Structure formats: C-alpha cells, structure tokens
Design an enzyme around this catalytic site. Structure first.
Site, PDB file in Angstrom:
ATOM      1  N   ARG B  11       0.886  -1.059   0.027  1.00 10.83           N
ATOM      2  CA  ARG B  11       0.044   0.033  -0.186  1.00 10.83           C
ATOM      3  C   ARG B  11       0.864   1.246   0.149  1.00 10.83           C
ATOM      4  O   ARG B  11       2.042   1.166   0.300  1.00 10.83           O
ATOM      5  CB  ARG B  11      -0.938  -0.036   1.318  1.00 10.83           C
ATOM      6  CG  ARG B  11      -0.085   0.019   2.328  1.00 10.83           C
ATOM      7  CD  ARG B  11      -1.031  -0.366   3.540  1.00 10.83           C
ATOM      8  NE  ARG B  11      -0.596  -0.077   5.124  1.00 10.83           N
ATOM      9  CZ  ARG B  11      -0.689   1.004   5.571  1.00 10.83           C
ATOM     10  NH1 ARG B  11      -1.339   2.053   5.032  1.00 10.83           N
ATOM     11  NH2 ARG B  11      -0.080   1.555   6.578  1.00 10.83           N
ATOM     12  N   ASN B  21       7.538   1.210   0.202  1.00  9.38           N
ATOM     13  CA  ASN B  21       7.404   0.013  -0.586  1.00  9.38           C
ATOM     14  C   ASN B  21       8.031   0.224  -1.861  1.00  9.38           C
ATOM     15  O   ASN B  21       8.359  -0.782  -2.733  1.00  9.38           O
ATOM     16  CB  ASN B  21       5.858  -0.496  -0.617  1.00  9.38           C
ATOM     17  CG  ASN B  21       5.509  -1.063   0.679  1.00  9.38           C
ATOM     18  OD1 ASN B  21       4.242  -1.027   1.109  1.00  9.38           O
ATOM     19  ND2 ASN B  21       6.314  -1.780   1.375  1.00  9.38           N
ATOM     20  N   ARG B  70      -6.257  -2.635  -5.013  1.00 10.31           N
ATOM     21  CA  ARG B  70      -6.940  -2.883  -3.731  1.00 10.31           C
ATOM     22  C   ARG B  70      -7.799  -1.780  -3.290  1.00 10.31           C
ATOM     23  O   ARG B  70      -7.700  -0.634  -3.927  1.00 10.31           O
ATOM     24  CB  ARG B  70      -6.006  -2.928  -2.664  1.00 10.31           C
ATOM     25  CG  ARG B  70      -5.999  -3.825  -1.535  1.00 10.31           C
ATOM     26  CD  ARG B  70      -5.076  -4.342  -0.978  1.00 10.31           C
ATOM     27  NE  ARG B  70      -4.515  -3.312   0.280  1.00 10.31           N
ATOM     28  CZ  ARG B  70      -3.135  -3.336   0.284  1.00 10.31           C
ATOM     29  NH1 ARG B  70      -2.232  -4.194  -0.209  1.00 10.31           N
ATOM     30  NH2 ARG B  70      -2.698  -2.334   1.532  1.00 10.31           N
ATOM     31  N   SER B  79      -5.582  -1.523   8.657  1.00 10.30           N
ATOM     32  CA  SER B  79      -6.048  -2.830   7.869  1.00 10.30           C
ATOM     33  C   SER B  79      -4.989  -4.079   7.880  1.00 10.30           C
ATOM     34  O   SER B  79      -3.808  -3.912   7.587  1.00 10.30           O
ATOM     35  CB  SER B  79      -6.110  -2.403   6.299  1.00 10.30           C
ATOM     36  OG  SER B  79      -7.045  -1.455   5.928  1.00 10.30           O
ATOM     37  N   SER B  81      -3.267  -7.965   7.189  1.00  6.07           N
ATOM     38  CA  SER B  81      -3.015  -8.642   5.957  1.00  6.07           C
ATOM     39  C   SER B  81      -4.341  -9.539   5.804  1.00  6.07           C
ATOM     40  O   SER B  81      -4.753  -9.331   4.468  1.00  6.07           O
ATOM     41  CB  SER B  81      -1.615  -9.477   6.377  1.00  6.07           C
ATOM     42  OG  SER B  81      -0.584  -8.653   6.559  1.00  6.07           O
ATOM     43  N   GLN B 102       6.270 -10.636   2.168  1.00  8.21           N
ATOM     44  CA  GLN B 102       6.479  -9.237   2.675  1.00  8.21           C
ATOM     45  C   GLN B 102       7.676  -8.454   2.114  1.00  8.21           C
ATOM     46  O   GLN B 102       8.910  -8.883   2.336  1.00  8.21           O
ATOM     47  CB  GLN B 102       6.536  -8.974   4.147  1.00  8.21           C
ATOM     48  CG  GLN B 102       5.518  -9.789   5.127  1.00  8.21           C
ATOM     49  CD  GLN B 102       4.893  -9.382   6.243  1.00  8.21           C
ATOM     50  OE1 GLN B 102       4.138  -9.977   7.027  1.00  8.21           O
ATOM     51  NE2 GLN B 102       5.660  -8.267   6.698  1.00  8.21           N
ATOM     52  N   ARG B 160      22.532 -19.731  34.546  1.00 13.00           N
ATOM     53  CA  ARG B 160      22.140 -19.108  33.113  1.00 13.00           C
ATOM     54  C   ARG B 160      22.864 -20.120  32.075  1.00 13.00           C
ATOM     55  O   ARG B 160      24.065 -20.284  32.009  1.00 13.00           O
ATOM     56  CB  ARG B 160      22.645 -17.761  32.796  1.00 13.00           C
ATOM     57  CG  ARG B 160      22.795 -16.827  34.180  1.00 13.00           C
ATOM     58  CD  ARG B 160      23.341 -15.319  33.778  1.00 13.00           C
ATOM     59  NE  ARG B 160      22.390 -14.741  32.902  1.00 13.00           N
ATOM     60  CZ  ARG B 160      22.769 -14.298  31.804  1.00 13.00           C
ATOM     61  NH1 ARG B 160      24.345 -14.736  31.427  1.00 13.00           N
ATOM     62  NH2 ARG B 160      22.230 -13.614  30.891  1.00 13.00           N
TER      63      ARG B 160
HETATM   64  C1  LIG Z   1       1.425 -11.014   7.996  1.00 11.88           C
HETATM   65  C2  LIG Z   1       1.247 -10.017   8.787  1.00 11.88           C
HETATM   66  O1  LIG Z   1       0.282 -10.045   9.945  1.00 11.88           O
HETATM   67  N1  LIG Z   1       2.264  -9.000   8.544  1.00 11.88           N
HETATM   68  C3  LIG Z   1       2.358  -7.844   9.568  1.00 11.88           C
HETATM   69  C4  LIG Z   1       3.568  -7.658  10.057  1.00 11.88           C
HETATM   70  C5  LIG Z   1       4.173  -8.919  10.806  1.00 11.88           C
HETATM   71  O2  LIG Z   1       3.648  -8.970  12.243  1.00 11.88           O
HETATM   72  C6  LIG Z   1       5.477  -8.616  10.878  1.00 11.88           C
HETATM   73  O3  LIG Z   1       6.264  -8.631   9.702  1.00 11.88           O
HETATM   74  C7  LIG Z   1       6.136 -10.016  11.706  1.00 11.88           C
HETATM   75  O4  LIG Z   1       6.892  -9.653  13.026  1.00 11.88           O
HETATM   76  O5  LIG Z   1       3.657  -6.262  11.176  1.00 11.88           O
HETATM   77  C8  LIG Z   1       3.275  -5.239  10.632  1.00 11.88           C
HETATM   78  O6  LIG Z   1       4.226  -5.040   9.444  1.00 11.88           O
HETATM   79  P1  LIG Z   1       3.862  -3.673   8.290  1.00 11.88           P
HETATM   80  O7  LIG Z   1       3.115  -2.727   8.782  1.00 11.88           O
HETATM   81  O8  LIG Z   1       5.328  -3.151   7.934  1.00 11.88           O
HETATM   82  O9  LIG Z   1       3.470  -4.355   7.024  1.00 11.88           O
HETATM   83  C9  LIG Z   1       4.197  -5.697   6.204  1.00 11.88           C
HETATM   84  C10 LIG Z   1       3.919  -5.160   4.510  1.00 11.88           C
HETATM   85  O10 LIG Z   1       2.723  -5.353   4.345  1.00 11.88           O
HETATM   86  C11 LIG Z   1       1.992  -4.283   3.644  1.00 11.88           C
HETATM   87  N2  LIG Z   1       0.680  -4.437   3.960  1.00 11.88           N
HETATM   88  C12 LIG Z   1       0.134  -5.273   5.114  1.00 11.88           C
HETATM   89  C13 LIG Z   1      -1.414  -5.173   5.570  1.00 11.88           C
HETATM   90  C14 LIG Z   1      -2.163  -4.595   4.303  1.00 11.88           C
HETATM   91  N3  LIG Z   1      -3.579  -4.571   4.651  1.00 11.88           N
HETATM   92  N4  LIG Z   1      -1.517  -3.722   3.166  1.00 11.88           N
HETATM   93  C15 LIG Z   1      -0.210  -3.941   3.119  1.00 11.88           C
HETATM   94  O11 LIG Z   1      -0.123  -3.100   2.304  1.00 11.88           O
HETATM   95  C16 LIG Z   1       2.762  -3.218   3.882  1.00 11.88           C
HETATM   96  O12 LIG Z   1       2.847  -2.084   2.942  1.00 11.88           O
HETATM   97  C17 LIG Z   1       3.876  -3.449   4.648  1.00 11.88           C
HETATM   98  O13 LIG Z   1       5.039  -3.084   3.685  1.00 11.88           O
HETATM   99  C18 LIG Z   1       3.362  -4.242  11.481  1.00 11.88           C
HETATM  100  O14 LIG Z   1       2.330  -4.416  12.522  1.00 11.88           O
HETATM  101  O15 LIG Z   1       4.010  -3.241  11.426  1.00 11.88           O
HETATM  102  C19 LIG Z   1       1.631  -5.572   9.878  1.00 11.88           C
HETATM  103  C20 LIG Z   1       1.865  -6.439   8.803  1.00 11.88           C
HETATM  104  O16 LIG Z   1       0.471  -6.798   8.342  1.00 11.88           O
END
Ligand SMILES: CC(=O)N[C@H]1[C@H]([C@H](O)[C@H](O)CO)O[C@](OP(=O)(O)OC[C@H]2O[C@@H](n3ccc(N)nc3=O)[C@H](O)[C@@H]2O)(C(=O)O)C[C@@H]1O
EC number: 2.7.7.43
Lengths: 229, 228
Positions: B11, B21, B70, B79, B81, B102, B160
């Site tokens: 996005r 991105n 989207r 939003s 995943s 990702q 430890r």
């Molecule tokens: C599968 C999943 O849950 N991915 C989430 C990850 C995941 O938890 C970590 O990688 C592992 O620790 O965490 C997040 O990670 P982040 O916000 O950076 O998002 C991962 C990439 O996916 C895109 N995305 C995600 C959801 C959506 N509805 N649209 C999207 O375009 C983004 O553009 C981004 O580049 C976070 O909370 O910050 C949110 C992400 O959605």
C-alpha cells in the site's frame, strides 16, 4: 560509599576472527567504544579490563582503562561470564559493585550507565541489567521423535496484532550486567532486588547479531558515542 | 496442480514516510527484491502485488508482477493482512494457495520459496510461514505500580545457560506466510496442518528492525538475491 568498578572482559581467542576485541570498528578497536562511554560516564570508581593478551592490555591502557591479567582458563568457549568476573574480584577487595560491560555492544552511551548507577544509588537496587523491547511472535519447535505441530506461544493467530498494538516483550541485549559483590560471590549474575534497564533498539544490536563487520561499522557510526562534543 | 499465487501487499501508506514499498533500496525499489526472488523461484502459477497506488502498480509491472488494485478499506494503517489477502481472493477464485510475501524482508532467496512450495506437496500442509532462531533471555515487565519486580520467563538466573547449553527459540521473521484458500477464507493465515520454515539469520532482518534505511541497503547488497 560503595566502589562501582566497570569491568570489560576481553579475551584473546575470539570466535572466527581472532583478537576480535581490539579489531578496528569504525577506526577504533572494539573495547574502545565501551571503555569510552564507561569513563565519560564519570560514575565508576575504576574502569577495568580483564584480558589474557598483551595487545589487548595495551589497547585497554591507551583508552585509560586499568588492566587485570589472567590465564586462558576463563577464556574458553565453555567458560562463563561469572567465571571471569569472580576471577577478577578475587583480586580486588576494594570493589563493592561490578558493572560488567560487553564490548560486543559498541553503541553504549554514558547516559544509560549514569541512570543505572542512580538506580542502584537511589533505589538501592542490588543488581541491574540492560534489556530491549521486541515485537516478534513465538511458535513452539517440533519436539524430538517428531510429531509435527506448532503452537502460537504469543499471539492468537485468529487475530494478529500490529506492532503498535501491544507492548512487545523484553529481552536482554548483552550490553551490561551490574551486580553487587555478595551476589556474584554467590553465583548470581542477577538477583536480590533485581531490575532491568530498557535501552533503545539503536544501541542494542549485537556485533555478532549484525553478522557483517562493516554493517556493524555502519551502525556504530550512526548510533555510537564518539566521546565529548 | 493447485494454483500457487505469490502475493505482495504494497500500500502507499507506510506508517510515516509513504511509498516506503517503492523507495529505492540498494538501487532498486523495495518490492522489486521480493518480486525477483518470487519469479525466479519458478514455483508460482502467478505472482501478484496488491496495491492502491499508481506508482507502486507501475514498478510492480516493471518487475513482471501482475497487479491488483486494492480497495481503500484494506489499505489503511489499521488494515490487517488477512483483510487484504481476503479482499484479493475475492477476485481470484482461481487461486488455491496464497504465498504472502512481505517486501519488508528483501533478503529473500528463491531457494527458500521452492522448499516451502515442496513442503506443501509432500507433507501436504495447509499453512507454512517463515521463522528464525534466536537465543535471547526474556524478562517480565514491571506493572501495577508499587515496588514491582521483573521475573525471568526464559531461564534461571541462578544457572544461566550458554549458547550450547540450550537451543534458542523460534520467532516469525515476517518473510512469508503460505496458506490455503480454505484457511484464509475462515480467517486464519496459520492453521490446519501447520508448519514453520526456519530461515538463515542473514535473511531475516526486517526493514523496521535495522531502523537506519541505509543500513538495510548494505544488508541487501551483502545478503540479498540479485536475480540472474
Ligand atoms: C502477515 C502479517 O501479519 N504482517 C504484519 C507484520 C508482521 O507482524 C511482521 O512482519 C512479523 O513480526 O507486522 C506489520 O508490518 P508492516 O506494517 O510493516 O506491513 C508489512 C508489509 O505489508 C504491507 N501491507 C500489510 C497489510 C495491508 N492491509 N496492506 C499492506 O500493504 C505493508 O505495505 C508492509 O510493507 C506491523 O504491525 O507493522 C503489519 C503486517 O500486516
């Protein structure tokens, strides 16, 4: 008042690249980063370095650190930090509190060491160690004899949370371990009235964790303490 | 054969400086890294990119990835995943397995994607995601005021362990999440016959983790997949 001694254990036979403790990282041999923040903290009654090598002793002295020599018995990959820490105290009674600092965390700043000293001075803490907050999900490991099955040790898969939706968890970062003599002289690196100290993620990346030395050099140059401005 | 589609959600909004991105990393816009590994794996019946921005759609096409525009509701900072992956499938009932990758983990290599694809064949898994091993001691956080104390949740302070004395723990690394349609449909990225895939540490450093973008640049150069 008590005697707070900064102690940096620096053996000669490191992993992979030997004599890693005085290898130049951003133009400064490793121990120099941590020793500098140590001294500039102006909170220690003495800044020490426990080594077994002539070159480490020299570098240490160049950075204004006192040096304690030892054999390689506590320099083995099977040896422990407590092993070498007791080895040291067993020679300096004046030392009441040991601030054990690891050179593999070159991004330490005197500010943090000053606040920890204050936690011990003011809130009478017995032991204090550096910690870091992380937001990563944990899942079991297929047990021996196989069976194949993982379980979410953290989150609820039905509802995965964003990183800003939950405090993460706290993990030691290896930076420092402060402890009173009666504690170390009992087998505990941490104990008694225990406390952790949360440092910034920018200062928590371990040298061996970055993997590459230059990426590490890029890191220290961007987030390390270079001395007095 | 079951339709295995690669899906990279990208996005425009990135919590902070937008278009992260599509921001160049080591000379190539971020999504390009992951897309490249995806295509070169030669294991996907399709490689898609779900976005809500024009610029990202172009770059996506330049890397030879199909593009799905989207809806705004699934492109928000809130939003999840699952909401987005579920909005994608709504338009591709032809997809049976979604390989959610990702962009924020650009050190992906096609070898890992090919092995996971195969895990879904032989072992027949419903869901497989990437994981990484770490050896870090965990400690309880202080709360409920008072002279609250931190407690060990991982080890015994009296004794430890050493690196050898024990095996670390497995954490997700954000790299990828493979899941079958029926799982996704019922709101689970991980479920059914679940399995993790342990990746090398050098390939598990998230963008948000290194913090300093340039640091990630040197990382992809030393540990990324440069195509060919
Ligand atoms: C599968 C999943 O849950 N991915 C989430 C990850 C995941 O938890 C970590 O990688 C592992 O620790 O965490 C997040 O990670 P982040 O916000 O950076 O998002 C991962 C990439 O996916 C895109 N995305 C995600 C959801 C959506 N509805 N649209 C999207 O375009 C983004 O553009 C981004 O580049 C976070 O909370 O910050 C949110 C992400 O959605």
């Amino acid at each position: 008042p008590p005697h707070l001694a900064a102690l940096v254990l620096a053996r000669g036979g490191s992993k992979g690249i030997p004599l890693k403790n005085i290898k130049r990282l951003a133009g400064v041999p490793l121990i120099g980063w941590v020793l500098r923040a140590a001294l500039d903290a102006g909170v220690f009654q003495s800044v020490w370095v426990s080594t077994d090598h002539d070159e480490i002793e020299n570098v240490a002295k160049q950075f204004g650190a006192q040096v304690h020599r030892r054999s390689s018995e506590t320099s083995k990959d099977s040896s422990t930090s407590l092993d070498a820490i007791v080895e040291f105290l067993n020679y300096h009674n004046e030392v009441d509190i040991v601030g054990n600092i690891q050179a593999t965390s070159p991004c330490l700043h005197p500010t943090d060491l000053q606040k920890v000293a204050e936690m011990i001075r003011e809130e009478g803490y017995d032991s204090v160690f550096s910690v870091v907050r992380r937001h990563q999900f944990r899942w079991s490991e297929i047990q021996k004899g196989v069976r194949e099955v993982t379980e979410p040790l953290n989150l609820n898969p039905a509802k995965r949370p964003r990183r800003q939706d939950w405090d993460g968890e706290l993990y030691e970062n290896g930076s420092f371990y402060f402890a009173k003599r009666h504690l170390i002289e009992m087998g505990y690196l941490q104990g008694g009235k225990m406390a952790y100290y949360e440092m910034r993620a920018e200062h928590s990346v371990d040298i061996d964790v970055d993997i590459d030395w230059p990426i590490a050099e890029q890191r220290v140059l961007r987030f390390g303490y270079f001395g007095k401005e």
